[PDB]
Amino acid sequence: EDPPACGSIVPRREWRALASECRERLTRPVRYVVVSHTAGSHCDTPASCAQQAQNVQSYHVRNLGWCDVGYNFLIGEDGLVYEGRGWNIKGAHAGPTWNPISIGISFMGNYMNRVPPPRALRAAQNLLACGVALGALRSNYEVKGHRDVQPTLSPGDRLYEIIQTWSHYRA
Amino acid sequence: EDPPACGSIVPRREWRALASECRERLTRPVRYVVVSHTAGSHCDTPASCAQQAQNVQSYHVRNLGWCDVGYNFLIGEDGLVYEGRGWNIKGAHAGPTWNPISIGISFMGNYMNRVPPPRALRAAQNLLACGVALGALRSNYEVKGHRDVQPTLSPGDRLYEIIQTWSHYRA
Amino acid sequence: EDPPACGSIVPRREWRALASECRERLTRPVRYVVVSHTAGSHCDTPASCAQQAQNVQSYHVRNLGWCDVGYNFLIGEDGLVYEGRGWNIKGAHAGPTWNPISIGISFMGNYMNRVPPPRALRAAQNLLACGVALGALRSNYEVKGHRDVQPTLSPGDRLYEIIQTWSHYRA
Amino acid sequence: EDPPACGSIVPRREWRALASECRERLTRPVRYVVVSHTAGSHCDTPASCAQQAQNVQSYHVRNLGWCDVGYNFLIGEDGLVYEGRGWNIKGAHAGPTWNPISIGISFMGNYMNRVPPPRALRAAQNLLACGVALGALRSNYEVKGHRDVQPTLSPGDRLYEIIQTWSHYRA
Ligand SMILES: O=C(O)C1=C[C@@H](O)[C@@H](O)[C@H](O)C1
């Protein structure tokens, strides 16, 4: 019986997202969070970041044939969180073994030789507390890098060393 | 230091604020929240809004002689919340009767002939919600507008209307 | 690396384990084994022991919110070995420094005031020879007692008394 | 302000503690407090209790190779508190999840079949009031029993029964 507010998320409709066709659910509460980067263009304003959110979803649906944008949430350098598949629907961001048991949040950019700005990290972190607040994440959830669960550079050398310093990181 | 979370607030230092010099403390937990608009330029990128927070504080300090920017928090149209005097230092935004007992948050822009983006409204309500969990804001806080509290056109015709729809609104 | 069907380990399904959620892996051959007891009530039947193994998992999983019962294997007084996290997943039985480089077998019961029956000791030693045959443990593995790596009364005095005699033990 | 005013703690040198080598720090204000018990023998006089603080330390530094005794503070039945790693240094009493986010305080003795004497329970409650005064603990900190976060009988049945009673207990 826990309903009270948490965080601000730019909702699906606001970034003009094509409707989702996904239906398979995740079991509450989820234990894992997998952090990735989109290795795409970065954006630093709400307008440019909505455009970008759109280009990622578009590529995932129109080209890779997924039911919706791959991630559960995306993060913009504008410091805003963008609604992806949400807390309840299984994403498609870290392979068949990890997708069924995790929330995948992806920073929008290529963080190999750049770090995302403090407002991004802050937003990403708020998001997770919120997940815990809503009961979508276990209070003792675990943060993982994309590269820890799949062979990739994601989330980029720099954002990778950053996230290892997070309270909930577990190699 | 401090683990980065509650309602993604842009910290003082991040928006290049001059150091605060106020020492009057506020009585946690506070009953009222007064909404005002700054009546200055509006911005909508994190870059433009930090510069605007900087400009508002500068007018209050260099010109008006105040110990720091008047409001406890500033909400930019970029959808981020800006740390003014915070949850602990008594503000200066609604006169002697109200400053000691209420928390003031201000929307950056003139909202007489305009409304702020949904994201600004989200950052706002979500800032108050994050207040509660601090002890800053009592669970059942009442929200007054600047008009309901002092003879001002603030927070603007159109923004004022919106405010009255809000949940914890006791005029 | 022959094909010996060593050890009669009771499968998770047989004692009715709740599905594990652990994904962390151990690198074989593991160089260490840490012996603890559950400090709890004991069982001398394949029927109570299956139940006790359930109880223990329930504690670690429902109370402590863990990904599975902590030990890799549990030894009952009934003379059988219950599959915990097995030879390949990293247990949670002796801390951050030893978990990654060891396998934790734990005797069901409290052995401060009793030695565990010869069949339990036999289950344990055969368990270990078995691990060596599968190549999961180094032929020259070292056996430490729980209290030798973490502050605890575990594995119990009498049993600590016994494991110190064991060929593979090492201060 | 009502000037600090808290605790009569027997410092490290007074009990002769080996120089600490631990460097990793806690960030204040700390939110959780974990109550354990030494599980070993008790002590009811200053030199008697100062003798144990030294033993317990020796066991953790000499036998397990740690940088300093495990707990932040120990409670003798002489009714004194003994300095452990204190308020600022990360302890080693409840695992990698809770160590970096709590203060571990352990009663010297085994409270399975007995309770600490009023003096001891006062020394502990007073210790915590103090931590809050010094701003080393959140004013709304939570007290957890060792067994609530690690598998162990610590702090013993009867003491566990006692802390469940405490104002800041939460499981
Ligand atoms: O100051 C704090 O540590 C916090 C307290 C809670 O309200 C949380 O909801 C917040 O994210 C962090």
Side-chain angles (χ1 to χ4, degrees):
Chain A
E1 293 292 81
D2 291 279
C6 198
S8 328
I9 303 166
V10 178
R12 286 201 80 91
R13 285 190 172 123
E14 199 171 313
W15 52 271
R16 295 167 204 174
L18 308 153
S20 178
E21 298 301 325
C22 305
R23 300 287 184 244
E24 277 312 307
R25 302 175 69 83
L26 280 168
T27 308
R28 275 176 44 108
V30 166
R31 191 178 291 277
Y32 307 89
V33 173
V34 174
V35 182
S36 51
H37 68 166
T38 62
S41 280
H42 65 255
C43 53
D44 55 44
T45 71
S48 54
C49 276
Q51 192 42 58
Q52 205 48 230
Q54 212 163 343
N55 302 327
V56 171
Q57 172 197 46
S58 171
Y59 169 72
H60 288 187
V61 175
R62 289 342 166 38
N63 285 357
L64 303 180
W66 295 345
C67 44
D68 189 15
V69 61
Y71 316 99
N72 297 95
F73 304 93
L74 296 89
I75 301 304
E77 294 195 22
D78 66 354
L80 303 181
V81 167
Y82 290 70
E83 167 116 278
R85 302 205 188 178
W87 294 108
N88 308 303
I89 303 295
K90 177 193 140 148
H93 60 278
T97 168
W98 286 96
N99 289 317
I101 48 171
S102 85
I103 295 300
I105 94 291
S106 175
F107 291 72
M108 302 198 283
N110 179 348
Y111 307 101
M112 269 297 300
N113 339 116
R114 290 184 52 225
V115 314
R119 39 167 191 285
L121 302 174
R122 272 204 296 293
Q125 301 210 257
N126 221 129
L127 181 61
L128 304 183
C130 280
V132 176
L134 295 166
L137 296 183
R138 288 202 76 80
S139 67
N140 54 334
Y141 69 83
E142 280 172 52
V143 184
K144 288 260 200 267
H146 194 165
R147 58 169 68 186
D148 291 332
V149 306
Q150 288 211 305
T152 164
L153 302 155
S154 195
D157 276 344
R158 307 298 292 282
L159 164 67
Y160 188 64
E161 4 175 336
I162 289 298
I163 66 167
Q164 290 195 299
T165 69
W166 282 10
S167 201
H168 288 242
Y169 180 76
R170 299 282 190 282
Chain B
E1 35 223 321
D2 245 11
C6 206
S8 336
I9 287 167
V10 178
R12 290 189 71 92
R13 288 171 71 203
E14 198 186 308
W15 56 264
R16 303 198 66 94
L18 299 148
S20 156
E21 300 267 350
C22 310
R23 256 200 279 280
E24 285 195 83
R25 279 189 136 248
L26 219 31
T27 77
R28 276 221 261 211
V30 29
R31 171 185 218 125
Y32 299 104
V33 164
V34 185
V35 176
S36 77
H37 78 325
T38 65
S41 289
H42 30 278
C43 50
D44 69 344
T45 60
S48 68
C49 284
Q51 179 63 74
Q52 198 57 226
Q54 230 201 342
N55 294 353
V56 164
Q57 172 199 50
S58 163
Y59 179 71
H60 294 190
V61 179
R62 298 193 156 94
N63 289 28
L64 289 179
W66 291 351
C67 56
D68 187 41
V69 52
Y71 325 102
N72 300 90
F73 307 92
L74 298 299
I75 310 81
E77 276 182 20
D78 62 352
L80 303 182
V81 177
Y82 291 87
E83 206 208 344
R85 299 187 186 187
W87 299 109
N88 299 319
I89 296 76
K90 172 221 193 201
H93 48 80
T97 25
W98 305 94
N99 290 320
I101 73 183
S102 85
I103 263 153
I105 89 165
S106 192
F107 281 74
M108 300 202 287
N110 195 340
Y111 302 106
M112 265 290 129
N113 295 151
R114 263 173 46 79
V115 280
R119 67 186 148 263
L121 305 176
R122 276 195 306 276
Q125 306 180 274
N126 129 290
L127 164 77
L128 303 199
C130 139
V132 187
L134 291 238
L137 255 194
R138 64 195 300 232
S139 60
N140 63 114
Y141 53 90
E142 320 200 308
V143 166
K144 293 271 180 191
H146 205 196
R147 306 178 164 189
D148 312 348
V149 96
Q150 190 159 295
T152 344
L153 226 35
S154 155
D157 285 10
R158 284 173 131 234
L159 170 49
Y160 184 61
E161 291 154 11
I162 298 309
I163 257 19
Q164 301 181 306
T165 328
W166 285 13
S167 163
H168 305 271
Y169 182 81
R170 270 258 227 276
Chain C
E1 211 135 61
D2 295 329
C6 64
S8 275
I9 297 310
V10 174
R12 304 179 59 99
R13 201 164 282 150
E14 194 164 309
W15 55 271
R16 299 192 294 253
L18 279 167
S20 159
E21 288 194 48
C22 314
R23 300 300 199 258
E24 266 315 299
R25 285 178 72 74
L26 279 172
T27 145
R28 72 164 57 204
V30 167
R31 180 167 181 235
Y32 299 92
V33 176
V34 184
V35 183
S36 71
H37 61 172
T38 51
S41 68
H42 41 73
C43 61
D44 54 0
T45 68
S48 47
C49 285
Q51 176 64 51
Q52 208 51 61
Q54 261 172 67
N55 296 330
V56 178
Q57 186 197 48
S58 180
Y59 175 16
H60 297 199
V61 182
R62 287 174 192 163
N63 304 97
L64 312 183
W66 277 2
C67 64
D68 189 12
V69 59
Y71 327 93
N72 294 96
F73 300 95
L74 299 91
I75 288 272
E77 295 224 349
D78 63 342
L80 308 175
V81 174
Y82 298 78
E83 193 188 18
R85 308 196 177 179
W87 302 112
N88 316 302
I89 275 164
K90 168 174 65 198
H93 54 82
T97 281
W98 296 86
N99 288 332
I101 55 78
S102 79
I103 268 304
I105 68 164
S106 176
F107 290 72
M108 297 195 289
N110 196 310
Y111 302 96
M112 274 264 104
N113 272 9
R114 357 141 77 268
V115 263
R119 19 164 216 287
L121 294 173
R122 283 192 305 281
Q125 297 263 24
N126 173 39
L127 171 54
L128 294 184
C130 180
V132 176
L134 291 170
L137 296 163
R138 305 220 186 127
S139 35
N140 68 318
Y141 65 100
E142 289 157 40
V143 181
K144 312 273 183 201
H146 198 185
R147 61 173 60 165
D148 293 330
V149 284
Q150 280 217 292
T152 169
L153 282 189
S154 187
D157 277 337
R158 309 303 198 269
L159 173 55
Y160 186 59
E161 201 150 341
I162 299 168
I163 67 169
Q164 289 187 310
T165 61
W166 293 4
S167 174
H168 289 266
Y169 187 75
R170 193 194 197 181
Chain D
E1 193 186 2
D2 278 312
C6 78
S8 295
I9 291 169
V10 176
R12 291 178 72 78
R13 297 198 82 263
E14 197 178 296
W15 54 272
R16 286 170 41 150
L18 284 147
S20 157
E21 238 127 303
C22 301
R23 312 168 87 278
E24 299 181 72
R25 306 173 63 78
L26 284 165
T27 85
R28 67 214 278 141
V30 176
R31 185 173 304 273
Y32 310 96
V33 155
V34 190
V35 170
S36 72
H37 81 175
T38 42
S41 42
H42 63 263
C43 62
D44 70 338
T45 77
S48 188
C49 286
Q51 192 14 67
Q52 222 174 308
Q54 203 183 51
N55 288 338
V56 178
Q57 183 192 44
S58 188
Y59 171 24
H60 302 190
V61 192
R62 213 148 272 164
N63 285 149
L64 315 176
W66 289 351
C67 46
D68 176 10
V69 65
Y71 322 89
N72 297 107
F73 302 97
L74 310 104
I75 306 171
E77 298 197 37
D78 48 7
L80 308 183
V81 170
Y82 291 75
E83 185 179 21
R85 304 200 176 172
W87 301 114
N88 324 305
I89 304 299
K90 198 185 83 201
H93 54 94
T97 280
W98 302 90
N99 284 347
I101 60 76
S102 72
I103 284 300
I105 63 165
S106 184
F107 285 65
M108 313 204 102
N110 191 309
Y111 310 84
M112 283 293 155
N113 328 133
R114 70 198 230 85
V115 292
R119 320 192 283 290
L121 300 184
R122 262 191 315 260
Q125 302 226 56
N126 189 267
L127 171 69
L128 299 178
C130 176
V132 162
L134 292 168
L137 299 187
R138 286 216 174 275
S139 65
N140 70 159
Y141 66 95
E142 299 177 24
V143 180
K144 293 268 196 300
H146 197 188
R147 66 179 61 186
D148 297 334
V149 299
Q150 294 288 255
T152 179
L153 291 160
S154 155
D157 292 7
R158 291 290 183 279
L159 178 53
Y160 187 66
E161 201 165 302
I162 293 301
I163 72 169
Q164 286 183 291
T165 261
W166 294 6
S167 151
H168 293 247
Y169 186 82
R170 221 166 170 235

